[PDB]
């Protein structure tokens, strides 16, 4: 009866334990295409995820996606730190799906940007809707982290987002 065992309801197979309310609207506003963090805010949002079984990892900030005119990270690159904070973490999550307000035409290249593509636990395109993080969808990441990589990595990546996404949202307002 542990929560790490019953992440999944026995009617459908859907996950019931997943983000609710603010965490979803936190991580959507963070993985939205427009956000850009400098190494000021980037190491501040990331270092929120270092308490309570997580304080003993060499947290690897990914290299930034703009270099020359100003160097700054993007929002989705910091959401990848949720799925794989350390260097020696064995999680490689993979997911490709539609989203809400889907563009209809175009696979992943249209400007509406509602098409998630995660390769090796690095969010490559798209923004995290409810349908890619919440409860009820069989293609959110916490369901994908459950089936492919055990249930400890799904509960850790869900308890990482609950610590990370309010720390962004309370400073974004």
């Amino acid at each position: 009866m542990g929560t790490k065992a019953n992440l999944v309801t026995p009617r459908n197979g859907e996950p019931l334990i997943a983000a609710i309310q603010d965490f979803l609207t936190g991580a959507y506003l963070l993985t939205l295409k427009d956000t850009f963090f400098d190494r000021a805010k980037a190491c501040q949002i990331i270092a929120s995820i270092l308490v309570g079984k997580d304080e003993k990892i060499k947290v690897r900030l990914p290299p930034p996606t703009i270099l020359k005119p100003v160097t700054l990270w993007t929002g989705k690159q910091i959401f990848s730190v949720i799925l794989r904070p350390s260097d020696d973490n064995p999680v490689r999550a993979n997911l490709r799906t539609k989203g809400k307000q889907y563009c209809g035409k175009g696979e992943d290249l249209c400007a509406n940007d509602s098409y998630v593509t995660i390769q090796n636990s690095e969010l490559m395109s798209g923004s995290m809707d409810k349908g890619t993080l919440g409860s009820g969808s069989k293609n959110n990441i916490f369901y994908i982290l459950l089936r492919d990589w055990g249930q400890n990595e799904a509960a850790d990546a869900m308890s990482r987002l609950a610590r990370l996404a309010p720390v962004y949202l309370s400073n974004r307002g």
């Binding site: 309310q21 603010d22 501040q44 309370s170 400073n171 974004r172 307002g173």
Partner: protein
């Protein structure tokens, strides 16, 4: 348990210190930070006007009538915030208490009648 005079009751989940809390420009740190997700599903737009009719009310020294089917309309409350140098919707520019940088978006702000209740 506190309620909010619109049926949006709520257990007081956290009690932060005052210095960790998003003060606006004139110095007013809040008392009760309310979550904005209570609004778009409940559609209690009447709460969103009490933060406007209250905030114009204290600034003028007046009690704004919001009755049923009448009362003080928004098009005259909003032009009372402008006389006291406020945003005409009430969304005031705050700066965050914790990090010290200004918040990315404006924050709605004002006095609404929170009644403690017997739970």
């Amino acid at each position: 348990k506190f309620s909010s005079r619109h049926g949006q009751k709520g257990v007081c989940g956290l009690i932060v210190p005052q210095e960790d809390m998003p003060f606006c420009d004139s110095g007013i740190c809040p008392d009760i930070i309310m979550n904005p997700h209570g609004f778009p599903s409940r559609m209690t737009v009447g709460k969103l006007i009490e933060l406007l009719a209250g905030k114009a009310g204290v600034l003028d020294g007046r009690f704004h009538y919001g009755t049923a089917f009448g009362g003080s309309k928004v098009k005259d409350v909003c032009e009372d915030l402008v006389r006291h140098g406020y945003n005409y919707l009430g969304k005031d520019y705050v700066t965050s208490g914790i990090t010290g940088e200004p918040l990315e978006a404006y924050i709605y702000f004002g006095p609404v009648y929170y009644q403690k209740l017997k739970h």
